Symmetry: C2
Subunit: 285 residues, 2 copies
Amino acid sequence: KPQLQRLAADADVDRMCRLLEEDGAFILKGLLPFDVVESFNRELDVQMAIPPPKGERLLADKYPPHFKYVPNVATTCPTFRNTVLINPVIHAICEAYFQRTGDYWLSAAFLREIESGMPAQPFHRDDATHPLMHFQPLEAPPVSLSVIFPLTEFTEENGATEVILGSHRWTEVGTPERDQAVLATMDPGDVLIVRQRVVHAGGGNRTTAGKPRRVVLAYFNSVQLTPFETYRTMPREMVESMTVLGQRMLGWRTMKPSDPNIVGINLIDDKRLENVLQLKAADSP
Amino acid sequence: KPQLQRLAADADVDRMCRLLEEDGAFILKGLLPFDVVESFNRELDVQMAIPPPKGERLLADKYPPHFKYVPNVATTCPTFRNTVLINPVIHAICEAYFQRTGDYWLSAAFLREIESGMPAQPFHRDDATHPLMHFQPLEAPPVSLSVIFPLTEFTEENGATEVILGSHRWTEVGTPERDQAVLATMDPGDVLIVRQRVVHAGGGNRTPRRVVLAYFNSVQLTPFETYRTMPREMVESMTVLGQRMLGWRTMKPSDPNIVGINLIDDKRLENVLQLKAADSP
Ligand SMILES: [Fe+2]
Ligand SMILES: [Fe+2]
């Protein structure tokens, strides 16, 4: 039974892109160093500790009271914003993956903790946030990529992600059996990369009175697709402390879908947003 | 040869929907009163009279200079911002048209002025700005509507929009003959509504001709023009509907998106901003 391929972080990017086309997913081993993972985890500890907001919680109010979720970690976790978000290997993968569609940016990056006693999810595709994706044919340029960061170990017992290899080629999800999937068992520092249309399920957490399984999910989408999370209320000084790449990911610059769009997107006064704003960056004059 | 159907501005919206389904386009007669057209034209004149810019012009630099252009007219034309953008008939059409797709907003609205002596555009579908639309099948919920506001007369001579009726059902555009199209001859204040996938062409101007093109898209699609640099006092002078159109509020794609889009801190954008509107504090 074929398993998810595990590649070294410094492996060939064309190999990675071909695995996405064939299997639909793969794992990078030891992409993030321990100190970066540990730093990010402390920042996420802090956000987990903040008690539930008083009024409306748009996503959280739609799920049961046990739902553990922290949105838009880019705005509250410097290690994500300044280091993880701009990881060169992730962007090498994105550049290759999105060659046909053009520029991409961050639609969302958020935290989940899955506590002991949670059942596995049903098999599904991530095509709900932008429902138009449901009607995109297989042969169309991909518009979404999932980048999944385990922040605790992912094990068979605690709900390692279940992925059905090659299932992006299926017409529909159908009703597959659990033994058709393989597990994304991983350690902190690893990353799981999942192609659009791949059938998968969150593994829940079958441990008894154990610690929660922690994960950060980042969705990189074609700039044609509206970000779920809008980073437009971030302080200007915080945004100007990021690199150009980081700013581009968070929607603060004009971007370019592929031809036949020959102009761009996210612009105003027929000029680039960053020029209208006179936006500085950490790595630009 | 069947022509574009002309409806009264107070016609039933279900009749308008049937025409978009069958023909792919129709014309509303006298939607905007003379005084609205006049004030909008006066505002556009002011922008056209201001000296040209010292730097790159992203869209304008892609066309020959007989193509005249005022971008994102909502930022400079109060009549568009306060009256045209929130027209109840246009929004009745949009609400019906996008019932399978969810919320919609303004991707772009800009002036095109075509000087005399220009030939017509090639036939095309409006699927270039968001190329993913090219791969969306006919059966999918529509994600874009083209709304065309003539600000001068559209005649057979001066480049009335050329529209091929029923062409949304075509698998591909190819290279059509001009005689397949019919003309959207119109007076200022009329509006031409064109469904996604309908093959059409700008008529150029073979005598300037003035038109404002507005593209209302599913909120799933990133606006071409971003209105995020609008002064807060300008934003708060608009109605809630206007603010929603210009990207200043959280919006709702169709279920299975049960949450929304364009939000932060799991809250509505307008709540995080504490945004007032003309018709809601
Ligand atoms: Fe999922
Ligand atoms: Fe067009």
